[PDB]
Design a protein around this motif. Structure first.
Motif, short mmCIF file in Angstrom:
data_model
loop_
_atom_site.label_atom_id
_atom_site.label_comp_id
_atom_site.label_asym_id
_atom_site.label_seq_id
_atom_site.Cartn_x
_atom_site.Cartn_y
_atom_site.Cartn_z
N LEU A 103 6.88 0.40 10.03
CA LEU A 103 8.19 0.84 10.43
C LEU A 103 8.79 1.78 9.43
O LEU A 103 8.45 1.72 8.26
N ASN A 104 9.69 2.63 9.90
CA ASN A 104 10.38 3.59 9.05
C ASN A 104 11.65 4.07 9.75
O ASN A 104 11.91 3.72 10.93
N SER A 105 12.42 4.92 9.07
CA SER A 105 13.72 5.37 9.61
C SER A 105 13.67 6.15 10.93
O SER A 105 14.70 6.35 11.57
N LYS A 106 12.49 6.62 11.33
CA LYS A 106 12.34 7.40 12.55
C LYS A 106 11.68 6.66 13.70
O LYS A 106 11.39 7.26 14.74
N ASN A 107 11.42 5.38 13.56
CA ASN A 107 10.80 4.68 14.66
C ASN A 107 11.51 3.37 14.98
O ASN A 107 12.59 3.13 14.46
N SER A 247 -6.84 -4.70 5.87
CA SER A 247 -7.13 -3.80 4.76
C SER A 247 -5.86 -2.99 4.35
O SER A 247 -5.60 -2.77 3.15
N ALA A 248 -5.05 -2.60 5.33
CA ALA A 248 -3.81 -1.90 5.07
C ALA A 248 -2.82 -2.85 4.36
O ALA A 248 -2.15 -2.46 3.41
N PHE A 249 -2.71 -4.08 4.84
CA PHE A 249 -1.79 -5.05 4.22
C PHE A 249 -2.22 -5.34 2.80
O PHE A 249 -1.38 -5.46 1.94
N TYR A 250 -3.52 -5.39 2.54
CA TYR A 250 -4.02 -5.59 1.18
C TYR A 250 -3.63 -4.49 0.20
O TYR A 250 -3.72 -4.70 -1.01
N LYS A 251 -3.23 -3.32 0.69
CA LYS A 251 -2.72 -2.27 -0.22
C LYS A 251 -1.29 -2.55 -0.70
O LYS A 251 -0.86 -2.03 -1.75
N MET B 1 -5.22 3.27 15.30
CA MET B 1 -3.96 2.86 14.52
C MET B 1 -3.75 3.53 13.16
O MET B 1 -4.59 3.46 12.29
N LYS B 2 -2.55 4.06 12.96
CA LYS B 2 -2.15 4.72 11.72
C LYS B 2 -1.02 3.93 11.15
O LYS B 2 -0.41 3.11 11.85
N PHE B 3 -0.78 4.15 9.85
CA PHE B 3 0.22 3.45 9.10
C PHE B 3 1.18 4.42 8.43
O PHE B 3 1.04 5.64 8.57
N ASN B 4 2.17 3.90 7.71
CA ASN B 4 3.10 4.74 6.98
C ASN B 4 2.35 5.62 5.99
O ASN B 4 1.44 5.14 5.31
N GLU B 5 2.78 6.88 5.87
CA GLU B 5 2.08 7.82 5.01
C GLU B 5 2.01 7.40 3.54
O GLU B 5 1.02 7.72 2.88
N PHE B 6 2.95 6.62 3.05
CA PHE B 6 2.89 6.20 1.65
C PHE B 6 1.66 5.33 1.30
O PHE B 6 1.30 5.27 0.13
N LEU B 7 1.07 4.65 2.27
CA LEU B 7 -0.14 3.87 2.03
C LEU B 7 -1.37 4.75 1.69
O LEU B 7 -2.38 4.25 1.18
N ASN B 8 -1.31 6.05 1.98
CA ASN B 8 -2.37 6.99 1.61
C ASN B 8 -2.44 7.24 0.12
O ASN B 8 -3.47 7.67 -0.37
N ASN B 9 -1.33 7.01 -0.58
CA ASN B 9 -1.26 7.14 -2.01
C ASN B 9 -1.73 5.86 -2.75
O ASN B 9 -1.76 5.80 -3.98
N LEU B 10 -2.05 4.81 -2.00
CA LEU B 10 -2.43 3.53 -2.60
C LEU B 10 -3.95 3.36 -2.55
O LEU B 10 -4.64 3.81 -1.60
N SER B 11 -4.47 2.71 -3.59
CA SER B 11 -5.91 2.49 -3.68
C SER B 11 -6.34 1.33 -2.79
O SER B 11 -5.63 0.30 -2.70
N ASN B 12 -7.49 1.48 -2.15
CA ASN B 12 -8.08 0.42 -1.34
C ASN B 12 -8.26 -0.84 -2.20
O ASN B 12 -8.59 -0.73 -3.39
N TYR B 13 -8.02 -2.02 -1.62
CA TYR B 13 -8.18 -3.31 -2.34
C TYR B 13 -9.66 -3.63 -2.64
O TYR B 13 -10.50 -3.74 -1.71
N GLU B 14 -9.98 -3.79 -3.93
CA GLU B 14 -11.35 -4.08 -4.37
C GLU B 14 -11.36 -5.37 -5.20
O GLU B 14 -11.87 -6.39 -4.73
#
Lengths: 365, 361
Positions: A103-107, A247-251, B1-14
């Motif tokens: 989620l973000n300010s535009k959705n 995998s995304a949540f793990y970031k 499925m795509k996520f918020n763009e800020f997650l592209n700056n984060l390293s994959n969990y290892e």
């Protein structure tokens, strides 16, 4: 002077109030009966108690961040892979991961007219728009129509199956019928915090994570140890989903987000089948007493699939009734904050329930 | 499925302890995580056992018992305190309240890895001093140059993973020149140790928040207080900073058992004294060993000591130690050819010296 990020302007000032039990004790009540937080009335599972006592002298050690023992236990129980599981500090933390990832300010996000308060509260940080169905209870038709209308905007949908604070539950097949029409880029969060209870009352309400994630790549199933498993104080829950979502949540997840004691106790709690069966059987046989009491007092309810029942009022005031109960040592949940003239009562032990009925009958006269 | 763009700056969990069972070790000696070598404070152990049957109950979200205990210990008000799931969580609140993609933070050349890792979410600029150790003068000059951009500063006093510590007076001297819209985070996770070695290193929260309305003091129950497994730490600051954090903090963010055990841990003064005394007497043996083996160290104010190498390689040394059941922290991930050894019990430290002596031949 000192300023903060602009998004904090959208958040409400938050001062947790004086504990209600402390208040009641200052009032000099004969005894305090707590039926307001959907905790297990039988307490902590005995296998977890022992596990905790044995692991009390290990409290100095950081937990194994791989969390392999609990992940493997969950994977076995639900017949999924470890890569499909994440562990959070309560299922609440997994809701946070979901919100921040999408989620973000535009959705926007979609939910029932009256469901768990924290969805919208957590979403406020992102500044995302909240769409709610007119129906306060979950309704398949209303969800389909409101989603289709805002399909380009809605990137996260909450289904609370069964629902807190109302108690209702869509059939699993109705949920899957809805999810089939949801776009692949929209995350469907199924909050199954109370689904063990619902499943016990009616198999048609039972959700099967392995089937959900095999069929839908956009589904996150949330479970907790806080309710049936009697570990609410430890803060441990989990999410099950396609590996890409985990995998995304793990970031986002901080390492060591869960305590070593919670990891151990959760595993023990899952192996105490006699305790959980005792809990479920007491929940529904005692709920009958609650239904009978409401019927006898002309109190409207919603038939419930959770570990609580909700009483709705017209001429009487839920705030006034809650204060009167509190002054007799009985702590229930006032639903005024949800915009409802209602109280939510957690189904307690037979002793606790009898005290509620005794005092409330007096109060209603 | 795509996520918020800020997650592209984060390293994959290892687990290194499991690799020790895998390698085939009888006894594993763990000196890698800055844990209390004597374990969990016994008053906390009894508290946990006694409250084992209360694990089903949500904690009191006001957290009044622990807040009051901290307020009394440090002579501040409850409104100056926040409880986090480790001090780590309070770092997260600080970073999320102030940093964003258009501003920056400042830190020493080599300090706690999590500061930078947590800040990646916000996409903020990281300014690091040339000096790997904290240096008053470099902090002043680098802050002044980027004064309009820096909105958060980390001071790790004493420093993990190097072990050094500025005097409190130097920290205070620096903070006086910092703008009111810049939050100074004083990470005092190991300050109880530094204070014991040298009172000039001691930080006093009530004095810090009285004199500065932009300072956040961070403390933890994970190190000296031996509750690292439970995840409970705290922040002390001006009421306006704590209020902001309370907008970000999830309710029930700390367990009921942690709240109870932290209160019990602070009333076990014999255990904490024992820990501090052991720490520095044993540290002397590590200093003597290094000196005897021509190993460069940084004199330490923490509960660990860091050994630096030239011709030898920290990764190879770490593996060799692991093969003998001795688990230390390799600092290769920080870009250093070094190992950080937590000061253990006298038995643990003797095993290290005996095996490492053989490894160095």
């Amino acid at each position: 002077g000192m300023k903060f990020n602009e998004f904090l302007n959208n958040l409400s000032n938050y001062e947790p109030g004086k504990d209600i039990e402390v208040i009641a004790k200052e009032y000099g009540v004969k005894e305090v009966i707590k039926l307001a937080s959907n905790e297990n009335p039988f307490g902590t599972p005995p296998k977890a108690i022992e596990c905790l006592r044995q692991n009390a002298n290990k409290a100095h050690l950081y937990p194994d961040d791989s969390m392999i023992e609990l992940k493997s236990t969950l994977a076995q129980k639900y017949k999924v892979q470890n890569e499909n599981i994440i562990i959070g500090a309560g299922s609440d933390q997994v809701i946070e991961f979901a919100i921040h990832s999408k989620l973000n300010s535009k959705n926007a996000f979609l939910q029932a007219g009256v469901t768990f308060a924290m969805y919208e509260i957590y979403a406020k940080q992102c500044g995302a728009k909240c769409y709610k169905t007119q129906s306060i209870t979950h309704n398949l038709d209303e969800f389909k129509k409101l989603y289709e209308t805002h399909k380009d905007e809605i990137k996260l949908i909450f289904l609370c199956l069964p629902n807190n604070p109302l108690g209702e539950c869509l059939d699993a097949s109705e949920a899957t019928e809805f999810i089939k029409g949801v776009n692949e880029d929209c995350l469907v969060v199924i909050d199954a915090a109370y689904n063990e209870f619902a499943s016990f009352k009616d198999s048609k309400k039972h959700l099967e994570p392995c089937e959900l994630i095999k069929e839908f790549d956009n589904v996150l199933y949330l479970g907790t140890f806080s309710k049936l498993y009697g570990l609410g104080g430890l803060r441990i829950g989990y999410g099950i989903a396609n590996a890409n979502i985990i995998s995304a949540f793990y970031k986002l997840r901080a390492p060591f987000n869960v305590s070593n004691l919670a990891l151990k106790a959760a595993v023990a709690a899952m192996d105490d089948d006699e305790f959980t069966e005792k809990t479920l059987e007491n929940n529904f046989s005692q709920m009958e007493l609650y239904k009978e009491f409401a019927k006898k007092h002309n109190i409207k309810i919603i038939d419930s699939y959770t570990n609580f029942i909700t009483y709705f009022f017209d001429e009487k005031n839920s705030t006034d009734l809650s204060e009167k109960l509190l002054k007799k040592g009985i702590i229930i949940r006032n639903l005024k904050s949800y915009g409802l003239n209602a109280i939510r009562i957690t189904i307690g032990t037979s002793y606790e329930n009898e005290k509620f009925f005794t005092e409330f009958d007096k109060i209603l006269r």
